Design a protein around this ligand. Structure first.
Ligand SMILES: [Cu+2]
Ligand SMILES: [Cu+2]
Ligand SMILES: [Cu+2]
Ligand SMILES: [Cu+2]
Lengths: 128, 128, 128, 128
């Protein structure tokens, strides 16, 4: 903890948390994502992507259209504040982003953009 | 035919389609919604609401807040392009709207605003 | 219609129906499955598999263990009343089964066995 | 904590955990469910129900058909190992059950039976 959180995406298309809080004193924040399941990336890949709650749907829709090879994210999507790579069973990836990119009193969402996963794999992030 | 679509929302909280293409030649377009289930409106009510993808989240959140009596939609919400009433088991409702309200290049989303249903009851609509 | 149904599974990991009624006057019933999406079989393949509600979990878990080469279905699983092949984008398949293999008073479920899909891709089949 | 777990069901149809482990040395185990949301029971009611993974579908289908007044659970359902009542905003309920009712090498699932919630509100319970 302290300017970091560890999150897991499993073979049941679930993240193990629905809410992340970022302490306003952190200059940067790190998310460390792992996949504890046994299914591969092409079947059950997960990423953790952060955007405003208003932008989540356009990011998910354009992410599906970019496809597989682009980790289901539009290249240089300006609405994505930070994201990991798409990972499979046994893998891990971290992303560190500057907390100054987040406003107090704005709602943010984290989600996975693998096709169909965002319906269940999503949660809120808020500054504290 | 052609400028209309029949959509069902059932007791599994799912629509029977997640993509609607509106033909550029239609002067108007009709959505015919029915609820083939057995559950009452106060527990599994569904409506079909249209907005841009960017506005979806605000419409769902203010909708949730307006309550069952307002069909979970903010009264006179300017972000709502077109909508049906909230219907329960065995009911039907239709909405016809002007296609000039849509423009090519914009991403639209249709969804249900009953609390929690948009997680699964959502789809894209595009003018082609 | 009546002694056959057309079903589709899409890129949003959803079937277009979650309840099928088989008329007792049908001696045989045909299910025609299509995949109207763009994702390939190994990422978003779908099949239509029928069993009793009590055997669905067993069929899904062992199906998952059999892998893609087995269309995610255990070879000669006796709990499966009928099934299609696993199809990907733009493919289709059909299966016909005898209605006397069904009895009134028993709960049946149709579902997809591609890993993770059964949570949303499932529905009831009832003999009426 | 020791032989007990605290779990929350929110307005986004999410449990705050998706995996419960019960230690074999516990003579009994307690689940304390709360609803930190603002939506009422008819809209977003949640309960915690435990059965084998095999029986979950039967419990969910029959639960749906029992009605709001029956807390969407079939009265005296033999397949339910333990359950809470259906609670709404600001409510709380607990269930303590005998760990002798669980056997090793059997898969258990906990889920909510409010219509449409089990697709998202479900997790595994394991005896170690
Ligand atoms: Cu994912
Ligand atoms: Cu709805
Ligand atoms: Cu599938
Ligand atoms: Cu619930």
């Amino acid at each position: 903890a302290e300017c970091s959180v560890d999150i897991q995406g499993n073979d049941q298309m679930q993240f193990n948390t629905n809410a992340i809080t970022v302490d306003k004193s952190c200059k940067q924040f790190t998310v460390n994502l792992s996949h504890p399941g046994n299914l591969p990336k092409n079947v059950m890949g997960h990423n953790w992507v952060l955007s405003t709650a208003a932008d989540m749907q356009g990011v998910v829709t354009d992410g599906m259209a970019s496809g597989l090879d682009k980790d289901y994210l539009k290249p240089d999507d300006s609405r994505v504040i930070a994201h990991t790579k798409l990972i499979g069973s046994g893998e891990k990836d971290s992303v560190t982003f500057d907390v100054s990119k987040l406003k107090e009193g704005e709602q943010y969402m984290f989600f996975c953009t693998f096709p169909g996963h965002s319906a269940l794999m999503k949660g809120t992030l808020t500054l504290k």
